[PDB]
Amino acid sequence: AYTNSFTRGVYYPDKVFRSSVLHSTQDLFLPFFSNVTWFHVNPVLPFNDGVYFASIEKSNIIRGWIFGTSLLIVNNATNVVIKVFEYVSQKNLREFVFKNIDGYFKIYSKHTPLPQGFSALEPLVDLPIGINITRFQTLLAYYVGYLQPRTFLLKYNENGTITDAVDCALDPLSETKCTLKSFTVEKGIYQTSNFRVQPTESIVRFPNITNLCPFDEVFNATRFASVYAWNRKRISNCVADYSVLFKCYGVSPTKLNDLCFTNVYADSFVIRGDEVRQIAPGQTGNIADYNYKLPDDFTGCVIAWNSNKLDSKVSGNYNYLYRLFRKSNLKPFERDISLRSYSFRPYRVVVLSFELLHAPATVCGPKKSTNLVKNKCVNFNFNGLKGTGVLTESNKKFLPFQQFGRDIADTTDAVRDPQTLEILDITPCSFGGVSVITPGTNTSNQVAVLYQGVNCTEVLTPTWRVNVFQTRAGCLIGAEYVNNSYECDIPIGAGICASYQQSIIAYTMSLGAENSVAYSNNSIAIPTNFTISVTTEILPVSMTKTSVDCTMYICGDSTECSNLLLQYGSFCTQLKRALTGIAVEQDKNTQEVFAQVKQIYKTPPIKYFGGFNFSQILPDPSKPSKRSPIEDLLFNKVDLICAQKFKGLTVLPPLLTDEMIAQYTSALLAGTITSGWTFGAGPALQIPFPMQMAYRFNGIGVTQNVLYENQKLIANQFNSAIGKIQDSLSSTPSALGKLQDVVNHNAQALNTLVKQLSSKFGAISSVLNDIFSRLDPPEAEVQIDRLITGRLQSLQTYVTQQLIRAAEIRASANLAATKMSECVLGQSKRVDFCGKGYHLMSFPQSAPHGVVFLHVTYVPAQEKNFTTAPAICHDGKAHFPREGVFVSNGTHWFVTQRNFYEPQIITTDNTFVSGNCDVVIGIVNNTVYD
Amino acid sequence: PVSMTKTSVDCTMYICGDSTECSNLLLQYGSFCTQLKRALTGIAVEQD
Ligand SMILES: *[C@@H]1O[C@H](CO)[C@@H](O)[C@H](O)[C@H]1NC(C)=O
Ligand SMILES: *[C@@H]1O[C@H](CO)[C@@H](O)[C@H](O)[C@H]1NC(C)=O
Ligand SMILES: *[C@@H]1O[C@H](CO)[C@@H](O)[C@H](O)[C@H]1NC(C)=O
Ligand SMILES: *[C@@H]1O[C@H](CO)[C@@H](O)[C@H](O)[C@H]1NC(C)=O
Ligand SMILES: *[C@@H]1O[C@H](CO)[C@@H](O)[C@H](O)[C@H]1NC(C)=O
Ligand SMILES: *[C@@H]1O[C@H](CO)[C@@H](O)[C@H](O)[C@H]1NC(C)=O
Ligand SMILES: *[C@@H]1O[C@H](CO)[C@@H](O)[C@H](O)[C@H]1NC(C)=O
Q1: Whose CA is nearest to atom 5 of ligand 6?
Q2: Which of A145, A208, A376, A745 might form a disulfide with A36, Cβ 3.0–4.6 angstroms?
Q3: Which of A194, A755, A762 sits opposite B31 (nearest CB)?
Q4: Where is this region: Putative superantigen (chain A)?
């Protein structure tokens, strides 16, 4: 019988209290939705890595368990009895988790008065036992599941209770949740992991020679050569079994059976005891200078054993001579047989040298050999060259002295088979990135998966599996390709986007609606109306000013680390200097954006401006902050601090307060409302607002009367647009994404810096006191230096990224200052610099870390077709319009301004004469009234 | 110039490249590869 484990089996991984957080734990868990064995009410079940044991009964039928390949637990009303050591202490679902880790036996449990719910198991007992549990059996409907190494994302409420968990490896959505460290996923595409084709078989290819090497002749020879004339023997074409046989250089003896050698030579002699220390690289002495000198870069093994009952003589042996005088010290592996005696009375040394650097293998250890598997991802081993990949028949042309082929990275990419002598390419097994496309968990749990840079024929590391489509970006699984084209929702790549239609669809993105302009050589479209448009532009100006405490981040009130940290010195001095430069740059950015005017202009008491209503951008006196309603909305629209501060990371306040920035903004607004563009170029010259509007209409080539004749309509359009600004900002949550992105970048950088303190950087632990109170001080300094270099590197990376982000923010602030000068303090002719349309004016509003420009532009509307001519022929003279264009109803001919239909009688006062009617192409006969 | 090549790096494959022992050792160096992946993803998005 089998059942679903649902989301049961979660226990508390430690004794730590965590409050209202999400924590990631690697531990032995019961995988979600596992297949759990079911029993009704006693087989002997295995104990693989720990056990989840649940039961649903109302009669206490189950009583205990016996653990062993011994340990016994019985739950009796008197006490629960544990016996191996001894210990004594103490329908409804009862769940237990049994683990045997690090010599300790741990039991977690819970009781609930399988169900489709979540309930964590609190720890029950920990016992020092020490036995090797391999099987277990219950003692008396119970369910059994098995633990596996897994990463879980557990959520702790404010009470420290685990209320939910995510099994990261269960499915793509869970992997995305674990990647984002949240239970909620916004719509988008997320790089989650890498897929890698896993090897199927392990192949071994060693030479077929099965003869054993003549080691015994070297070692068991009755007499050994004298050290001055040491013997050298070549080992070739044999199996070297080192178990028959010890200081090894460049290799470990316990691994010597697993490697292939090429130039192996045994050098044998007999020496006098202590000079054993002189058979070594670099060593000096009589033997190491005049008899036997090893290379500085010597790899191989020196094996020496005392031969007392082999060579000792009661009279003094004279068979072993040595060179006691010489001109100059020998070169490595150089012999001189051109001399004293030891006179041994009541040590044989052999030096094995070999080359492990590629080359054909002449001597190989005993490893057996298997078949040669091709076209499949396998773990291969060619003469000691281990690896994983696909082996294919080659078109390369090797040479007899060549055994391996190498690529740019000095990586072996082609190999000659030791037996068949064929050449094989080695490619790595197929792999790539994996992206998850989600419409958002608030919408659906449905996902699509993109395997990047890989076609669908080879689509494993993610261990989950998942409406198959091929794109230049890779293989898309879980999305249906539709022939319709929509605006891009989730970008996939190469023109392919994804969207949530009930289902996930992939499509070719559209660039917009096709449009054809009715072009002809004599037709012109002229607007007859206009719309006053007010658009919003949001610009970051400054970032958070950050300061870092050197020792508090690196050491954290540890004195040995603090004393060790002064061996670098200039590092964090320059780090603090860079951060201080960034902070003063932030204050400079704010100053250059908002302090353009030196007078603080006040808005007049009476707030009549010819029908224009500025109440939503002017300061609101009732509110204590004196902010405008739109500024109020902006500032509402955008314990961790203390925790970061306790690690040396603090935030400095900006020099200008939000109130002072609001004062600057209100001064700019009052200046522009009461004096137009004059206060930017000199003394503020007052002018009625309708007259300033007429000036700005003249700026964009529209005559003044157009605004005076449409004053009420223009004011109403402006008021309506300003009122819609509030709704557009408030309804849209993504409106202020730039400033929030600045805030989130700062927060993410700080969080990364904080979480790098748990990084060990390859040391025993990430805690200094553990290293200092559990290790020799000579090695404690080494490991603490490892940690210190890691943390200093983290700080330097943080500062470098802060400098790059500060440069980007400085560019943004320079652009904002330019827009303040050119869009707020004047009227700009630069296309699209101050909003879409013909710029009229702009109003600044302060925002938490930036500025918001409200651009008021003139957009032509209600265009009409007319027939046009370059010139009008009259009295043999060509007339060209002075400040307009010639248009026609169809019968009569007028002249009009270009951006607003205002037909006028063609007179000699709105045209000018140039030449006859013989050169201009398209000239039209008509009357020019005088 | 308007954009540059969008690059992605498989941190483990570059550093270790089929060596599982190297991967286990590399898992002890923290979120280095996570930071690099985030930075490169930001660059790639900025190109588009
Ligand atoms: C993937 O394999 C299919 C089938 O052989 C092939 O048509 C396709 O071109 C391959 N992908 C690429 C990128 O070449
Ligand atoms: C002017 O446009 C018309 C229609 O678009 C075309 O037939 C005519 O050839 C054009 N004029 C000249 C000189 O080509
Ligand atoms: C211009 O458009 C406005 C709406 O913005 C409308 O009330 C007005 O009647 C229009 N005028 C003309 C001449 O079409
Ligand atoms: C200006 O607009 C606000 C908001 O729409 C409104 O409450 C106020 O009465 C208006 N003032 C005038 C003078 O129309
Ligand atoms: C101008 O004429 C073209 C072709 O006759 C037509 O497609 C277009 O809609 C006209 N424009 C207006 C504003 O009516
Ligand atoms: C031509 O313009 C005059 C305006 O003075 C008037 O007859 C009419 O608006 C136009 N004719 C036609 C057919 O539209
Ligand atoms: C315009 O007038 C001139 C001379 O008066 C004549 O030659 C020409 O043909 C006229 N244009 C048209 C389109 O009739």
Answers
A1: A892
A2: A145
A3: A755
A4: 157-178
CB neighbourhood size of A799 (10 A): 21
- Note the maximum CA span of chain B: 43
How was this structure determined? It was done by cryo-EM
- Taking CA atoms only, the protein residue closest to ligand 2 atom 14 is A521
SS3 A50: coil
User: What are the DSSP calls for A112-178, one per residue?
Assistant: E---SS--PBEEEEEE-------EEEEE--EEEEE-EEEEEEEEE-TTS-EEEEEETTSSHHHHHHH
Give the span between the Cα atoms of A384 and A359, in whole angstroms.
11
Four-point Cα dihedral A911, A913, A917, A918, nearest 10: -130
What gap in Å lies between CA A805 and CA A811, rounded to an integer? 10
The Cα–Cα gap between A922 and A521 comes to 9
Tokens at residue A58, please? 């109302």
Torsion sign over Cα A855, A858, A862, A863: negative
**Rounded-to-integer distance, Cα A530 and Cα A860, Å:** 4
How many CB atoms are located within 10 Å of the residue A220 CB? 7
In which residue are the tokens 């024929």 written? A457
Asked if A433 lies within 8 A of B8 by C-beta distance, the reply is: yes
Crossing angle for the helix pair A777-819 and A570-594, nearest 10 degrees? 10
Concatenating the DSSP letter of every residue in A484-541 gives -----SEEEETTEEEEE---EEEEEPP----------TTEEEEEEEEEEEEEEEEEE-
Instruction: Identify whether the C-beta of residue A756 lies closer than 8 Å to the C-beta of residue A791.
Output: yes
User: What is d(CA A341, CA A320) in angstroms, rounded to the nearest whole number?
Assistant: 6
Rounded to 5°, angle at Cα A320 from A319 and A324: 135
Q: Which amino acid, one-letter code, is at A415?
A: V
Pairwise CA distance, residues A857 & A851, whole Å = 19
At position A29, the amino acid (one-letter code) is: F
Question: What is the A782 CA–ligand 3 centroid distance (Å)?
Answer: 81
Say how many Å lie between the CA of residue A868 and the centre of ligand 2.
Answer: 14
Terminus-to-terminus CA distance in chain B, angstroms? 13
Indicate the CATH number of A2-191 among 3.90.226.10, 3.40.50.300, 3.40.50.720, 2.60.120.960: 2.60.120.960
Nearest CA-CA partner of A855 in A537, A513, A379: A537
For residue A773, what are its two tokens? 């109170």
Residues across chain B: 48
Instruction: Kindly give, in sequence order, each residue whose CB lies less than 8 Å from that of residue A384, ignoring residues fewer than 6 positions away.
Output: A258, A259, A260, A356, A361, A364
User: What residue ranges line ligand 4, CB within 6 angstroms?
Assistant: A 613, 615-616, 723
A39, A45, A47, A48: CA torsion to nearest 10: -80
Residue B35 is nearest to which of A433, A752, A761, comparing CB atoms?
A: A752
Map tokens 């009796």 to a residue. A76
**Any A CB within 8 A of B24 CB:** no
User: Encoding tokens for residue A912?
Assistant: 């000018």
Q: Does B8 touch chain A (CB under 8 A)?
A: yes
Bridge-partner residues for A98, per DSSP?
A51, A107
Angstrom distance (rounded) from CA A473 to CA A452: 6
Let me know: does A172 contact A444? Beta carbons within 8 Å. no
Report the alpha-carbon distance of residue A827 to residue A695 in Å, rounded: 10
Closest alpha carbon within chain B to A761: B29
Q: Write the Ramachandran bin of A402: left for phi over 0, alpha for psi from -120 to 50, otherwise beta.
A: beta
Q: Do the strands A142-146 and A51-57 form a parallel or antiparallel pair, or are they unpaired? A: antiparallel
Contact A387 B18 (CB under 8 A): yes
Give phi and psi for B30, each to the nearest 5.
Answer: 80, -155
The stretches of A732-776 forming alpha helices (DSSP H) are 737-755, 768-772
CB-based contacts of B2, cutoff 8 Å, min separation 6:
none
Q: How far apart are CA A175 and CA A190, in angstroms?
A: 10
